Amino acid sequence: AMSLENVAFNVVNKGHFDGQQGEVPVSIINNTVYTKVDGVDVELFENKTTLPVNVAFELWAKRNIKPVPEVKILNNLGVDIAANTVIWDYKRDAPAHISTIGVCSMTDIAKKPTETICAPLTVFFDGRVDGQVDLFRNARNGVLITEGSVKGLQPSVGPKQASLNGVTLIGEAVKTQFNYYKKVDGVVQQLPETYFTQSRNLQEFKPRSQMEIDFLELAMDEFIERYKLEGYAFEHIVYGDFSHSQLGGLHLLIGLAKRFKESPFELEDFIPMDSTVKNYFITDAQTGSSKCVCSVIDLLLDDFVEIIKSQDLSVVSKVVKVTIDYTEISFMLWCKDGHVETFYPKLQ
């Protein structure tokens, strides 16, 4: 009994699609959905997707409002479609997946993930929804998230944080750390050992360890001294070199956050999407130091120190592959006379 007016009634009365009965008058003008409220049109949704306005409106109304894995994790694990839900990508203002399974008549490829069309796709299953752990067991390809243990399956502990309505957070009143399971061609995969990105903001950055507290509170030379980081190019890589026309280093989000409290800078997100490594065209407002492609990763400073201190510093240029968010991130390690010169998440 699905309609535009019923999807709109649910948005107006329930804050999202809740399966409630009823209709409100709707008007569509270009890429915006309006509703008549006491004789005047009130905007309900502006389509920022490449889908038809009414189709994107329904998928946004039918989005998952429970803490879900962040889109970068789902992408890294090869998720193609979700089972009976919509993972809304808040960084793109669009659905995270092209098609749906049992959500919207326009985007649905199947009603149940058991349909043979879903067999070659990695379907995302949520153990919190009844019977989805059993659907993962029967699926050929898929990713499963659970809050507890699964019989016969060994889990991969995911990041502490999940996305709740576009807000990335480590839950206190809700569980956000999931057990991850994956299957390729009927075979349960052994998920690799992985670091996780911390998913922090530049403006609301909070340290998550004593090393991170010391990075933000101490001066450059005393932090490098305290943590025995001499010869590891933290001055360039983490702190950033703003002395030349091309901005040097600044590849760790904690370093950008430290810089941000002293002086502002413009970060141009030229590929706006969720990813383990982010690329920004950065312009430092104080110095005028800039970089077209400044790759930034948000690792816990302890995790970054462990990665850089676990490298052989005897090569001039070397690709260093690190598992972050279940994906292989290539870094470029440049050394000279046994000391680091630069270390950055490899661009292009």
Active site residues: 236, 251, 291
**Cα 291 to Cα 53: distance, rounded to the nearest angstrom:** 37
Contact residues toward ligand ZQD (CB under 6 A) are 160, 170-172, 174-177
Interaction of residue 216 with a second copy, rule CB under 8 A: no
Q: Where are the alpha helices (DSSP H) in the chain?
A: 4-14, 53-61, 71-76, 132-138, 210-217, 220-226, 234-237, 253-262, 301-309
Q: From ligand ZQD, a second copy, none, which one binds at residue 169 (CB under 5 to 8 Å depending on kind)?
A: a second copy
Q: From ligand ZQD, a second copy, none, which one binds at residue 90 (CB under 5 to 8 Å depending on kind)?
A: none
By beta-carbon proximity to ligand ZQD, the closer residue of 131 and 171 is 171
Residue window 137-176: x/- pattern of binding to a second copy, with contact defined by CB under 8 A: ---------------------------xxxx-x-xxxx-x
* Cα dist from 69 to 150, 159, 163, 239, whole Å: 18, 9, 6, 30
Residue positions forming the annotated binding site for uracil = 291-295, 342-346
The DSSP string of 160-195 is S-EEETTEEE--SSS----EEEEEETTEEP-PPP-B
By beta-carbon proximity to ligand ZQD, the closer residue of 244 and 321 is 244
By beta-carbon proximity to ligand ZQD, the closer residue of 147 and 217 is 147
Cβ-proximal residues to 284 (8 Å cutoff; 6+ apart), any chain: 242, 247, 259, 263, 265, 290
Helix, strand, coil share of the chain (percent; to 5) = 20, 30, 50
By beta-carbon proximity to ligand ZQD, the closer residue of 28 and 169 is 169
Interaction of residue 270 with a second copy, rule CB under 8 A: yes
Work out the number of other CB atoms within 10 angstroms of the CB of residue 99. 18
Q: From a second copy, ligand ZQD, none, which one binds at residue 242 (CB under 5 to 8 Å depending on kind)?
A: a second copy
Q: State in angstroms the smallest separation of the CB of 320 from a second copy.
A: 21
Q: From ligand ZQD, a second copy, none, which one binds at residue 213 (CB under 5 to 8 Å depending on kind)?
A: none
Most distant CA pair in the chain, distance: 75
Selected binder of a second copy within 53, 68, 252, 305 (CB under 8 A): 53
